[PDB]
């Protein structure tokens, strides 16, 4: 029964494949060479940076590092708004609330710690420490100021009610550690990439895997939603980035070159979605014309691998972080 | 051109920079270590003197040098994702049960996995072979044979009972062979034999850490 339906799903996706995206996109003017320079380099992290997230206001970002401190920067003036001491030096994720009131941190301690930035008494304090994951937290993302989603190395993703401190919903389909998570623009559904080389689409309310996508040889480190919300792009240690379409249920495109052996640490989409920006273990980030799968540029200013990559909500700038402990803003 | 409020923000940022620098200055003093043992290793009891589900941490001092030892408890067989974090540690402490021969091939495979990891390329390993008393009583009894599990022991030249010395040197030699096969010299394995209760294991950890630091310093100064 398992094999018969799996072959039926293969037939269903193969029946739809009348054309490639390369055929449809073929007669379009290319974006051309895109040149971006590090307009600002933000320094003050004394160890390797693992995660960053932009604020919705587009001026404020948060970063996480191994030295054990979470620092919030005013990007325009290169000024540190806050520096937050962390109980565990080992942190692999950070998030910034949409309202900007809170930030979240997760790590090998398996606990998601939420911080209240705006308080009377003028300090950053722990609003909540969320327990219930038996593995390290690889990714955390905020629905609201009350609700946060997390992905963990125990092969399960969860939705939390921060005020209650308990998991409202648990998502359990993966057979391996879940590395990344991306909320949709509408927020009603989200996707996760995992070490079983599959990406699953999760409906946040019911708690069920609507669709599962498999095209990668190796683990999927990074995942991002196309700005429309009907497609997403995954990054892997296969050294390939693949664009997946929710409605068609299949891979439209794959972004690879023979020179590129290194794994993709992070991915993000430009505001229009024409540009797919990916971060690699080769210490550089390559910018892909997402419609045509042509490399349009390279961002190389980092001594060590790029751990994180993010694109501004307004779309003005790209911020990258790396293990050289300097995170740079590109425009 | 900068408002009074923006000037005060700049002063705040500079004070934050000062405090971060002080914290990093504190951080450099400590030497950081990672403990790895599959099971039956007795890895928790290696350092007798001095003793949080996600990570277990212990602090021990010898000769006014502070050491941090990290064990990551809950994780499964594949450690490739969390091991990326521990690439700046001074040394890795790898604990193996030399007494058990069924475990030994799996321990050798795990040591190879630690040795050949991309992120752990520059990190030396301090290898403790454990429960030597258990091994000694087992070889003196002679009921079990390393020759059965390993063909090479059946014909091996010894370099304390002489059979015990032969068996222990063979057990060491396999691990040092996996270590030596690379031959780059950026990272080297320090093999030790440890009883179930030994007063000095922190001393051994400290002297291999001093050797590691000495070698990195010699490479840094361009001497060798």
């Amino acid at each position, epitope marked *: 029964e398992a094999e018969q339906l799996k072959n039926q799903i293969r037939d269903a996706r193969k029946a739809c494949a009348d054309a490639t995206l390369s055929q449809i996109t073929n007669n379009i003017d290319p974006v051309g060479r895109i040149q971006m320079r590090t307009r600002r380099t933000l320094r003050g992290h004394l160890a390797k940076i693992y995660a960053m997230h932009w604020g919705t206001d587009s001026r404020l970002l948060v970063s996480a590092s191994q030295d054990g401190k979470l620092i919030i920067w005013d990007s325009y003036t290169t000024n540190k708004v806050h520096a937050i001491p962390l109980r565990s030096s080992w942190v692999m994720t950070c998030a910034y609330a949409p309202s900007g009131n809170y930030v979240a941190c997760g790590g090998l301690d398996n606990i998601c710690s939420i911080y209240n930035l705006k308080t009377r008494e*003028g*300090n950053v304090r722990v609003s909540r420490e969320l327990a219930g994951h038996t593995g390290y937290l690889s990714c955390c993302r905020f629905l609201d100021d009350n609700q946060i989603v997390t992905s963990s190395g125990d092969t399960t993703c969860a939705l939390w009610d921060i005020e209650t401190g308990q998991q409202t919903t648990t998502f359990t389909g993966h057979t391996g550690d879940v590395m990344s998570l991306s909320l949709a623009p509408d927020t009603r559904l989200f996707v996760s990439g995992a070490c079983d080389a599959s990406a699953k689409l999760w409906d946040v309310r019911e708690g069920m895997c609507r669709q599962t996508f498999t095209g990668h040889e190796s683990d999927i480190n990074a995942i991002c939603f196309f700005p429309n919300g009907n497609a997403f792009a995954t990054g892997s240690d296969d050294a390939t980035c693949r664009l997946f379409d929710l409605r068609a249920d299949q891979e439209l495109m794959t972004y690879s070159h023979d020179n590129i052996i290194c794994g993709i640490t992070s991915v993000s989409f430009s505001k229009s979605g024409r540009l797919l920006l990916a971060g690699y273990d080769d210490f550089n980030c390559n910018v892909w014309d997402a419609l045509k799968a042509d490399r349009a540029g390279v961002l190389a200013g980092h001594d060590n691998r790029v751990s994180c990559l993010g694109v501004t909500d307004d779309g003005m700038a790209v911020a990258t972080g790396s293990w050289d402990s300097f995170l740079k803003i590109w425009n | 051109t900068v*408002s009074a409020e923006d000037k005060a923000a700049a002063e705040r940022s500079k004070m934050i920079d000062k405090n971060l620098r002080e914290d990093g200055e504190k951080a450099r003093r400590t030497l950081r270590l990672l403990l790895l043992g599959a099971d039956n290793s007795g890895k928790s009891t290696i350092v007798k003197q001095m003793r949080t589900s996600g990570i277990f941490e212990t602090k021990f001092q010898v000769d006014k040098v502070n050491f941090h030892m990290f064990d990551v408890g809950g994780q499964r067989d594949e450690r490739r994702k969390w091991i990326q974090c521990f690439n700046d540690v001074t040394a890795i402490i790898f604990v193996v049960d030399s007494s058990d021969y069924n475990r030994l091939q799996e321990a050798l495979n795990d040591f190879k996995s630690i040795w050949n990891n991309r992120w752990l390329r520059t990190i030396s390993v301090i290898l403790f072979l454990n429960k030597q008393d258990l091994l000694a009583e087992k070889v003196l009894a002679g009921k079990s044979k390393i020759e059965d599990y390993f063909p090479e022991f059946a014909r091996y030249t010894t370099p304390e009972d002489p059979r015990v010395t032969r068996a222990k040197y063979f057990i060491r030699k396999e691990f040092v062979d996996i270590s030596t096969a690379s031959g780059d010299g950026r990272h080297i394995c320090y093999p030790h034999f440890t009883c179930a209760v030994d007063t000095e294991n922190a001393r051994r950890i400290f002297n291999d850490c001093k050797d590691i630091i000495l070698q990195m310093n010699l490479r840094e100064y361009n001497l060798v």
Partner: single-chain antibody, 228 residues
């Protein structure tokens, strides 16, 4: 969060007195600290001490004659006054201010201690008649435009209810201080500003002061009373 001011009483002219305010319930080291009110006249800003004591400013009248200091471990701020003069008679307020992106300076004010011994901000109306439930608009003007190239316009509105210390309502001409109802709103162009109070109620009634934080010295208008 509390600031309690101590010291005061009669000083003969030419004498010296020390006033201290004690901080409880907030991270006193992080906050930059400052203001006096003459017995029936408007507010005037005396001195400022930054976080860590790095930066000090005084107004021209007090400078050379007043000294401000903070004891961060003890959580106390002092003002050392010498050669006191009949002008110095006033109620001295201890104010907390924290400066970062999105912060609200001047949010909390102490009760104050009695003592008995340049952008020009103008509030056109001394008093305004009000009906409860009736919208009221208060206006202020600056000599120099308070809009800065960063884009912030540094205008602050304060409320002093009868027998109470001033309370921040609006910071930077549009943002609303925490704990303030939505009825207050601030609309302003550069050099011409206003505060709009709609559906006025009891306890909205007091003297309203407009302050500029574009540059030191910090100047308050005389302000507009509201009367039932």
């Amino acid at each position: 969060v509390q600031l309690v001011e101590s010291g005061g009483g009669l000083v003969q002219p030419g004498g010296s007195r020390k006033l201290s305010c004690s901080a409880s319930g907030f991270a006193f080291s992080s906050f930059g600290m400052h203001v006096r009110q003459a017995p029936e006249k408007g507010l005037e800003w005396v001195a400022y001490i930054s976080s860590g004591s790095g930066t000090i400013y005084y107004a021209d009248t007090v400078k050379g004659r007043f000294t401000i200091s903070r004891d961060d471990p003890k959580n106390t701020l002092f003002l050392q006054m010498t050669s006191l003069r009949s002008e110095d008679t006033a109620m001295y307020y201890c104010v907390r201010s924290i400066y970062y992106y999105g912060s609200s300076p001047f949010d909390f004010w102490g009760q104050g201690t009695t003592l008995t011994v340049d952008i020009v901000m103008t509030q056109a109306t001394s008093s305004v008649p009000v009906t409860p439930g009736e919208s009221v608009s208060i206006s202020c003007r600056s000599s120099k435009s308070l809009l800065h190239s960063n884009g912030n316009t540094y205008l602050y509105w304060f409320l002093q209810r009868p027998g109470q210390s001033p309370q921040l309502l609006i910071y930077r001409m549009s943002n609303l201080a925490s704990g303030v109802p939505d009825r207050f709103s601030g609309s302003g162009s550069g050099t011409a500003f206003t505060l709009t109070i709609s559906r006025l109620e009891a306890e909205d009634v007091g003297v309203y002061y407009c302050m500029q934080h574009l540059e030191y010295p910090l100047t308050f208008g005389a302000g507009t009373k509201l009367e039932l």
